């Protein structure tokens, strides 16, 4: 059968060198006590203020509430999509980007994890330099970029509060997180983790461990790495892609800060605002009224506009409001941006209404009319399916049982009897009519 290796095994060390060499462990001895206290106190400060939340993710089309409470901290305006859920950063005091902040204690913790982020980056760079030197024996711009952590994901779980899955392949026992890869990260980027634990043939069940295995491979024995207070481990160059990792629950609670280079080419506030302004170039912008007039009705421009319409609504507005008043407990940073994004979105609703108005114009030849329909039919259809999915998710039995502050909100939403909106929430009657437009031709 399957098996795993711990420092109690003679083969454990040689197995580490020959099969998991890009995995680096740094014990609490290598971390200053002054930094140790600051980070651990920051963990409990965020826990005391209730800044850690369990997420209502969707996996394989099934609504699941994660056993691990978590929070995202990182650069202002940055996001990390994980398990189809876009987490928004609680900002930390990056250089020349001073924040109005959150509550005073919460701001200290974010600065603290920024300080921890700086230290882990330095260790990662040295580790990557040593890794490259060893390979050379047997560019430097890449090493800095692959260690340039932009966000950290904090997690907390109390095993005593959760009724746990057994590890299925190597008998590693109870799991807090199943085998997986850390996704949505820059290619070959390193991951640094700070483990904060609290207080026989096989691994110790009471001690927290991180598991490791090769992808597609349960014949190679896995590694169970015990984690104590202040232990740090690093997933170097391509370990995260070639190997899977899991978390093995101990007996006591445990915090962890996992620092990542999030891939955010389409996941920043600056990126999405620029996308919104690209869509609104097709609108006469003298005044912000309800008489939306479009500069061009070219199918290519219309298709790009309605795609951006979906991106801001579903990847940003509905993602943000599905988590409810979660960040308001932590920071007010995203309040104005989400108001601005919602304002930009409402104008695009007028654009769509303008596009539908032009389609039904009397002096528009069927040649040009069908062209517009072919350009926007896919975009409007997805907007219909996704609105149904998000509306259903906000009313699922699991969702209705959440705490009031974390209750999902299907925002934006408006009843059919609402005249403040140019278009209704349900588009099926429009979609069916538009589909029949191409059928009659
Ligand atoms: O706590 C520790 O010691 C180690 N932390 C982890 O293992 C850990 N990784 C995660 N990564 C991840 C998973 C799925 C996806 N996705 O897009 O699907 C993206 C990223 C998520 C939660 C986690 O607890
Ligand atoms: Zn992970």
Author numbering: 27 to 164, 189 to 213, 215 to 250, 262 to 503
Authors' description from the paper:
We co-crystallized FTOΔ31 with 14a and determined its structure (2.6 Å resolution). The structure revealed that the hydroxypyridyl-glycine core of 14a binds, as observed for 4, in the 2OG binding site. 14a coordinates to the metal (Zn substituting for Fe) via its pyridinyl nitrogen and the carbonyl oxygen, its glycyl carboxylate forms a salt bridge with the side chain of Arg316 and hydrogen bonds with the side chains of Ser318 and Tyr295. The plane formed by the pyridinyl ring of 14a is skewed with respect to the plane formed by its pyridinyl nitrogen and carbonyl oxygen and the active site metal. This orientation is unusual, especially when compared to the more typical co-planar orientation seen in the FTOΔ31-4 structure. As predicted, the amine linker of 14a apparently enables its p-nitrophenyl group to have a different orientation in FTO compared to the orientation of the naphthalene of 13c. With 14a, the nitrogen of the amine linker is positioned to potentially form a hydrogen bond with the Arg322 side chain (2.9 Å); the Arg322 side chain is also positioned to form a cation−π interaction with the pyridine ring of 14a. The p-nitrophenyl group of 14a is positioned between the Glu234 and Tyr108 side chains of FTO. Notably, the Glu234 side chain is displaced ∼5 Å by the p-nitrophenyl moiety toward the surface of the protein, an unprecedented observation in available FTO inhibitor structures.7,20,21,23−26,41 Glu234 is important as it has also been shown to interact with m6A in a structure of an FTO variant in complex with a ssDNA substrate. In the case of FTO, our structure with 14a, provides evidence that the side chain of Glu234, which is likely important in catalysis, is susceptible to conformational changes.
The fat mass and obesity associated protein (FTO) is an Fe(II) and 2-oxoglutarate (2OG)-dependent oxygenase that catalyzes the oxidation of N-methyl groups in nucleic acids, and, in particular, of N6-methyladenosine (m6A) in RNA.1−3 FTO is a potential medicinal chemistry target due to its roles in obesity and cancer. Here, we report the use of structural knowledge of how FTO binds 2OG and substrate to design potent and, at least partially selective, FTO inhibitors. Using information from crystal structures of FTO in complex with 2OG and substrate mimics, we designed and synthesized two series of FTO inhibitors, which were characterized by turnover and binding assays, and by X-ray crystallography with FTO and the related bacterial enzyme AlkB. A potent inhibitor employing binding interactions spanning the FTO 2OG and substrate binding sites was identified.
